[PDB]
Design a protein around this ligand. Structure first.
Ligand SMILES: Nc1ncnc2c1ncn2[C@H]1C[C@H](O)[C@@H](COP(=O)(O)O)O1
Ligand SMILES: Nc1ncnc2c1ncn2[C@H]1C[C@H](O)[C@@H](COP(=O)(O)O)O1
Ligand SMILES: Nc1ncnc2c1ncn2[C@H]1C[C@H](O)[C@@H](COP(=O)(O)O)O1
Lengths: 520, 520, 520
């Protein structure tokens, strides 16, 4: 920060720049930060509300807030998102630049119902980014409080709190307490501003393409293989009795399923099938009971969304996996809603390489046949990785999360966030912010005790974030036209992705990245 | 912006400088910007008020305001306007320079009827000019909110909203939504100021001259042409019977109308004739029913003012075209007034080259004559452009619009604004302004919802605009004195173009540019 | 040409290169040229088949063939055409490069039903491009014989013949005879190849954008004009009697139609309205009788397609102008078909700036009102260009013609081909080709007479054409998604723009260039 009160500390930048193979998206918002917990750290636990053995937790809640811009629609307008997914086979972030400026602090007083708000010029806020990843990382959990979709909106900064190890509702001795005033933090008055730059580590391009071939069909339809398979264990029946024979054919156009193949579909961890038409579902509650969930340290944790898998089969639109999809709300929807209010995403583009989430991986033989014994087989509901598997990660959506932090561990297998996006070992740091305490008048004779009495105040201002995205051009030689993302065209009562008569911005549908096709 | 609170960011400049062939006019005003729509974008449509099939509309309304200086009297004092039109055959703009400064922001509170206004030092405003013409262009539509005629007046900035395509009151899928926080915009506190410069593209000089000749009379009166015309299809009657003969004369002083001519009058699109003396008009409502209007996409849109055409005939002062004139209000006139309160402009100076707006273009033969058949002709009410036409664009008035933006299209014919002034493919950019939201105290526990609750505030300050005009000197050799624009001379209850006893500035009459004459 | 028989004279190039602001499209085909008219020039005329006064013609037919690549789908794959129109606001050609190579000549013999074809090594073909525009120009008339849509197709070169002035079926003395062996032409054996380069003259970008605003709605909806209009010619009726009064309002949000406007819709030349649902059409033949046609030199020539005008009104999909559209055939359609077999193009994107082709331009007052006389008005069916008109040229389609040659004349008004594309004063030259005559054995004693007896032969080979196209990028700030051209998505019996089970390439629908929007 340089100049004084009457000089703005930074300009509004919200813009998109499409140049060559890069796209530089800048977005600026206006934020407001309350005073959390009356400047106190409080240990929160599930002991207060009984809950259940699976939902128990122990942790801390802090006065600090934090900035979240982990969703795409923060950085992209629906138009810009349309250019991205129509013209390109992939994109990944490169650089990041972050600014706070035009900081204002207000003090508020309450007298007999009157609420008076006045500028407090000399009070400060505290901002620090954690570069060393020393704090618990609560980003990537898909919480709210991210910058709004719509530039003209104003948002409130969420509170920062974290969870640690526990036994029941108590605290095991490995539990950690992190005091956030124990880090260096820059203090900013109304003239000061805050800025830093960041550079993403190298990650694979996201795949914005949907394959035009399937694993089983990669063959050549016109030509007949030179590899035999075992066609029949009996002689061709003449209508009398089956007679033992071994007969081998060649894989060919007639029979593709029997034909030899180099590759296997991706792994699957299966989940229940739910239909959108109510009368086709069973009458019972199978939501939690018939759920697909993993058992960790005595806790049954629902598997959501789970391993990336095709949501439904070919001809079945209405079915969806119980836990296997990302689900979004329509504008103005509460936290408890019915089916019509949610926006449900499906992955139909991974059908070629991936199993259907609601169905088996395959079928495998469970016993040794003999003359007297008959061949038996069992179904494979779950399958780990086998040599020769290929798969496709879950798509990212305009509302979906951009990145998540790969935990620090001895090992991991093909880390990518199951919700979607870019797994990062060193993600964009957490930016934390707090209103510095201002004490109310002290008693005039010394007492050691804690104040607990402060001037109520809040601070507002603008925040801007600029990410440099890298692109991968579409090389395809396909003759016929691609699928594209297309606006409505026919007349309707109001425009999609635009404010209504009341000024409420609304997103009608989710938008995935996979339209353009390429060979498998 | 440079210095702090207690230092004025710019001087008052309102001045006129007449040097050589240029005139540099500077004008400065004090403006006030409210808070529109509580910082919201609202889709507006004709669905709310039923209206009629022609008046349906669909669009958006924005919190942003915009500066309009599209009228001449913004830049010209009546004296300066008098020098311009008396001494010159034409003028066109060259350069433009724009400044905002001395910006003040006020916060206002309402308690039990008391209205308290106090400075808010740290709050900002947002200003950006659209250089790339990316927004809808609402200038040139002759709306209100332009800088006042009179330097000592204070004005309020109009709200920015725009219209798009529609079907009925609904929105066709080609409708566009433009978020104006999606552009880079400079943010200004009380110490900051805003400035940019502009340069007009090359355009034809406006014609401030009224021709001293007419198309039909361009000939030499003393000499007799060598070209024959067909004088009579009968023998000169001796009082008995007409006898077929063909007879040719020479065009000469006796008969000028029959004489051969190189040029044709300008095009016309005809309109109804209305008289200012009530008893001469028909008793009926022909205003909308007998109107001259064009039919576009099922909508009947009145043609106003229409193609430039002489308002009345030679000896008829009282008649005026129904839609064919620009009409101004007298001081202190409501939006619904009678004839005496309007200031009605007439073009009598284009009578030489242009058709009369209330009368036919000509008469043309509709059939092939024969021995038995008699020659028939039909009237030409509308005429498109024909090779050999000359015409004069509508004059500009001290109250009239300076420029309009030529739409971006494949083709256009002789673009000039039908209201008047300079057609520009890249007009002066739109300068937009908004008061940055200041949030009221947030709830202290996190909620995702939109604030909707802000501190009510407005901002005021000064704006100055300086246009460099180029002139074309009067070369004429005419012996006798010109017509000029002359002040009243005889005593009257109050001065014209000056404040009355109540401080109300008033413009008594419109003033056109065409006085000086030149040969056709 | 350089090397000999056993060395190929050129490689196959069919490719598309998208780089920056340019797109370089190369296409190569295999052609076959018969022997026309037994090497004779024959005067053709309508005297042979009586026809009618409008269809009479006189001209010549030549042995020469000519290469036509005047349609877009020659140079563009449907995919490439999709990139073009989705990503860009305009495109125009820059350079042209043309090659003949791998020329083969075959001689054919017919004995008792056996058809024997053998190479003729020493025979030649003749090729010359007309750079000086000395020949009649038959390109741009939208004939057949253009390179096929589909690279793997083989096509036959059309015959070159031309028409001249005539009186009835006879020849006026101004008729011209052009012998095409009177030009320099390169002669090519199987080793030789032919090449030349060309550079387009500078032309306006085609407009691939559809306006998001309309002329009538360009105003600002929130603000009220300072210009009065004439609202009513009577006093507001109290239910007793109309009383003469003149009353003026301000143009404002309530009444947009009465509001003053700077611009006028494009010109129109009207045409009859036809409905696609048979029962709504009149029962009669109005095709030719009720047609819109122009009368030239006693000939009534249908106006097709005519001036660019919106095909139908807002809510009416089914109606189309009688002559006012370009009509394409579906695959495998004869030259006489019903409605279902044609592919009918509509311009709905010029509705904002252009009149509807089936409806009036406007309405205009035909008489001078008085106390006794009532105001009368007449409809404007045709309108020439008036100052202040803007319009949009007809769109170009993937099947449509690319260019046409602006005739050489004293004057023209806004030349653009009414069918579509780029008007050129010096278009790509006509490339002509012929098989040089090979005489059959002469009689062995001298006779002066014409041979008339030759060896029957034909020649085949490849032709490649490479055009360099320039692009105009899409700058728009529009928030919500654009309309795009999108493939079918849902399952269907066969792929669009691809061969069927029989190998027949087919184009399911026409594809226009106008999807992306911009402000008017
Ligand atoms: N989302 C994500 N983040 C980080 N690492 C990943 C991810 N997905 C896969 N991988 C690992 C596993 C692959 O062996 C390798 C491909 O990197 P390539 O760059 O394609 O050669 O990268
Ligand atoms: N108002 C306006 N704006 C822009 N272009 C116009 C206008 N009026 C006419 N023209 C065009 C049409 C004329 O052919 C030409 C005269 O330009 P000159 O400079 O006089 O040679 O300019
Ligand atoms: N199709 C076509 N070919 C050639 N000339 C045309 C065509 N359409 C319009 N014009 C002329 C008429 C306009 O005055 C001018 C615009 O050129 P601009 O380049 O846009 O300044 O070009």
């Amino acid at each position: 920060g340089a100049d004084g009160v009457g000089n703005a500390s930074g300009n509004w930048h919200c813009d998109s720049t499409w140049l060559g193979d890069r796209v530089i998206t800048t977005s600026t918002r206006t934020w407001a930060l309350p005073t959390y917990n009356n400047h106190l750290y409080k240990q929160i636990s599930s002991e207060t509300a009984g809950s259940t053995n699976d939902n128990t937790y122990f942790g801390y809640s802090t006065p600090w807030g934090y900035f979240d811009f982990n969703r795409f629609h923060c950085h992209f307008s629906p138009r810009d998102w349309q250019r991205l997914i129509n013209n390109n086979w992939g994109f990944r972030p490169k650089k990041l630049r972050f600014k706070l400026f035009n900081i204002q602090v207000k003090e508020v007083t309450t007298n007999d119902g009157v609420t008076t708000i006045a500028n407090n010029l000399t009070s400060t806020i505290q901002v620090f980014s954690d570069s060393e990843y020393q704090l618990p990382y609560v980003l990537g959990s898909a919480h709210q409080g991210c910058l709004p979709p719509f530039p003209a909106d104003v948002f409130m900064i969420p509170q920062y709190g974290y969870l640690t190890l526990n036994n029941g509702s108590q605290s095991v001795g490995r539990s950690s307490f992190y005091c956030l005033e124990y880090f260096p933090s820059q203090m900013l008055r109304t003239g000061n501003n805050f800025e830093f730059s960041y550079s993403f580590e190298d990650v694979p391009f996201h795949s914005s393409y949907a394959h035009s071939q399937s694993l089983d069909r990669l063959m050549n339809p016109l030509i007949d293989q030179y590899l035999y398979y075992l066609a029949r264990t009996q002689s061709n029946p003449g209508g009398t009795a089956g007679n033992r024979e071994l007969q081998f054919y060649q894989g060919g156009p007639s029979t593709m399923a029997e034909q030899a193949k180099n590759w296997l579909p991706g792994p699957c961890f299966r989940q229940q099938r739910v239909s959108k038409t109510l009368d086709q579902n069973n009458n019972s509650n199978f939501a939690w009971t018939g759920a697909t969930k993993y058992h960790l340290n005595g806790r049954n944790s629902l598997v959501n969304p789970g391993v990336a898998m095709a949501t439904h089969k070919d001809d079945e639109d209405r079915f969806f996996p119980s836990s296997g999809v990302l689900i979004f709300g329509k504008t103005g929807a509460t936290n408890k809603t019915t089916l019509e209010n949610v926006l449900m995403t499906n992955e139909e583009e991974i059908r070629p390489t991936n199993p259907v989430a609601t169905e088996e991986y395959g079928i495998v033989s469970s016993n040794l046949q003999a003359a007297n014994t008959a061949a038996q087989t069992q179904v494979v509901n779950n399958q780990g990785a086998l040599p020769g598997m290929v798969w496709q990660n879950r798509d990212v959506y305009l509302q979906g999360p951009i990145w998540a932090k790969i935990p620090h561990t001895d090992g991991n297998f093909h880390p990518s966030p199951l919700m979607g996006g870019f797994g990062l070992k060193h993600p964009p740091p957490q930016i934390l912010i707090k209103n510095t305490p201002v004490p109310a008048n002290p008693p005039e004779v010394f007492t050691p005790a804690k104040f607990a009495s402060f001037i109520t105040q809040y601070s507002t201002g603008q925040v801007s974030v600029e990410i440099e995205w890298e692109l991968q051009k579409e090389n395809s030689k396909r003759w016929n036209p691609e699928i594209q993302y297309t606006s409505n065209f026919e007349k309707q009562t109001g425009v999609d992705f635009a404010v209504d008569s009341q000024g409420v911005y609304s997103e009608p549908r989710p938008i995935g990245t996979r339209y353009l096709t390429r060979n498998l």
